[model samples]
Target: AQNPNCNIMIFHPTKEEFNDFDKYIAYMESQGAHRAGLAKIIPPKEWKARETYDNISEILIATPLQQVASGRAGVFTQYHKKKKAMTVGEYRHLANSKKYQTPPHQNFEDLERKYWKNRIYNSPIYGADISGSLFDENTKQWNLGHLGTIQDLLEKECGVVIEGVNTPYLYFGMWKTTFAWHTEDMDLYSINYLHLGEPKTWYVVPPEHGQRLERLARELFPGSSRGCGAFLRHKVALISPTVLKENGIPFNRITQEAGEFMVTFPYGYHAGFNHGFNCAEAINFATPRWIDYGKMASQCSCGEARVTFSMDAFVRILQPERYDLWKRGQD
Candidate 1:
């Protein structure tokens, strides 16, 4: 009777309908389509509005520009390769090095060698891009340049169209090298569409389950342990559609041909792995917009609003605590 987890709603219009962008927008709006904010479970409450509509829309449109500038072949290739080799310590050292410069030189090989040679290997995470950014000891939010560049590439290469308000930047990099399992800053909602390659494998553990997993990892791994502590609040586990079905999770099948499915996941305790034999690419759209119950009820012309409120309340109950480690970083 109670549901606290995120709900998954799926819609697969005919090719003709999808091609009609205007119709898509109209359909979404008619369904009371609004952005959902990231609701947290830690501190026992959700973080209020931080990102707005205008900000998200700007990022979406500007993404094309950013991609054109940074998505050159040699640039990202060298960037990812060099970062994979560096130790966390080396990453920190170079990241702090004011002597370092950007828009690397013409001799790509030489530039890569120069940057990676001094990298430290302290932490499990690798990749110069991530390591270098971590060097700013006082800063918690990622540099806008790095984030913007990646977002631009995704938009350009993957053809992701962003809409709505308070959209966040797109992030790209190898796992273990660029990021470990970490919750994002500013409670935000994300929707991703995989466009290329094989499907990824992801695990979605409910918030309480995540805490149990962290506690187990802490006891077993000690120094290398990472916890899903406060970040675990009000989160759902959205796994790759394939993985979800394989594991017997209920999901809405979207299309028979493309193997698309819709799943609503609690944000906290989920991690994704690219399981495809080849590289995979997906379009991710995030927004800070959330459903406002009181507003909806006031605007309701009939009893329909009451039904919507009931569903919203059900979703809140089913929501799980996912990320409990929100205190470690900031947006």
Candidate 2:
């Protein structure tokens, strides 16, 4: 019932380096890159040591992390609550409002100037969706439209397909003082690495068994575990440095450093918490890149109804005039 048998893989930087803060800023400025405060990865060598620039790059890899239960709190709940009941228009309006304005640390204006300025004129999908907050300032937001469009672009333009049947994609982000709980769609495998100044406290539970555990936690701990489930719920059985290693489930932990990892599963769930108060940053990438409509069910639907209903909706949206064009392209 629990992901006791889930697998995890962790990667750590073999070599670590530090650099002066000011000179590193200058180097990024000269390269026309956005001066987004501290850059995550640095050049092989101090390209401008004379100017007091110091930075470094470290890489790691992991594989076969099993899915486990995660608590939903912080920004995760906020996003879920706000997005779950609203239409795309409502969400967009809220995003455009001052309430959802970009954070000061993001330096979104500079990023827009560097990457999106001229790129807007390239193609049909080149411009931003005013109704969709894909990129707020320069940071990424996980609206359905944005995720779908990005997936479409990657498949159509890069010949990369992301099917969640084998493994679902993992996503993370932040808003003000709230840190979102880390969660992923059910997939074949999963591996996530943290690269900011925070230690996340995570709880893992067995799938389809969360309800029972949440109930028990409420009875025993009451307010302490208000958000936790009860019936056969997989509890936060263990925690570790980079990955949670328990009952054959392998989660490779990469902390405050750069690395990569892979997970193989059809449907899995995990959650995270960032201990640091300051803004956090991390880079996460995964593959066998594909998409599965069914994976969207746990968060939104139930079983086959999820995929069936989605395809129907998709077909309804296809314009008759463009069907031939789309078919021709597919052919």
Candidate 3:
């Protein structure tokens, strides 16, 4: 039986079309593909040679690991708060250990063992140096920092790498290591490429249903929403597809395999969990079309941790000639 959530826009682009990054995405967005808030890109098969992960053994940096207590699909209000540190290599070894195979079932001993130890998941390896083989050197292919055309406008303005936002970050996942519902920073578009590993399951709510998702999240977690405006950005809440469907909200389920790219649109609410051990990198970028969304973001409050990049300044610097015109387009 086929899963209805598998229904989504899938584009098979040749190498040339993909190298022309911004143009390809703009075309996709213009064709109303952005309505789903996410789309799949299958690059020409030849490019698969660039996907490699052997260089991770050299990564001596200590990375944070999220110790998830439960694999259940529900509100994980305290998940992000519990964390420990370990080298990426060490984590990889631990993830592959045989004890992890012990299922966390009804037996108290097994369940307690799984909850306390084997449930470790790596946090985003933000600011990771792309000098490593884990990243593709050809920026236009999938490197967000050096991509051409519209470019990561944020990078052109900041004049430096801002990991995980304008720059790429690596993520290591194990089965049931989940990312809760949330939109990208400043509501910018995000692109994630799975280098190698088992598939990751993604749940996305289109931009049209974005407001409804937010309303539902607020309704469900009123205390958190009240405590922090735009509480979903906190990345602490999780709502199952069952609940979403129960509320008449539409969403899509994407099973992203290795070498596949998942591009998420501005203001789109998305979340998912890893199927098993996998490595993926993601970064944010803004096209000319994102200016309107940036303007909206500037006017809105994103609590205390609001992304500090100034949209007005970015527009002025990127289009000094027609800066006024862009400002007029906003109102």
lDDT of 3 by residue, 52-99 (tens): 567675454344445343333344443543335555676566556664
Task: Give TM-scores for every candidate, taking all chains together and pairing residue i with residue i.
Answer: 0.31, 0.29, 0.74
User: Which residue pairs collide, candidate 3?
Assistant: none
Best by TM-score: 3
**Per-prediction CA RMSD (Å):** 18.5, 17.9, 7.7
Cα lDDT of model 1 by residue, 1-331, tens digit? 1233422223545544544433543454344322211111111112111232122211111111111111122111112122224332343344334432132445533433332332222112222111111112332222111222223322454464433222222322221121123232222223332222233333344432334444443443333223332322212222233333454443222111112322222233344332111111122222212222211211111221122112232122222131121111211
Q: How do the candidates rank by lDDT, highest first?
A: 3, 1, 2
The number of residue pairs in model 1 that clash at the backbone is: 45
lDDT, candidate 2, equals 0.26
Candidate 1 root-mean-square deviation in Å:
18.5
Estimate the lDDT of model 3. Answer: 0.64
In model 1, which range of ten residues has the least summed lDDT?
60-69
Winner on lDDT between 1 and 3 is: 3
Clashes of each: 45, 57, 0
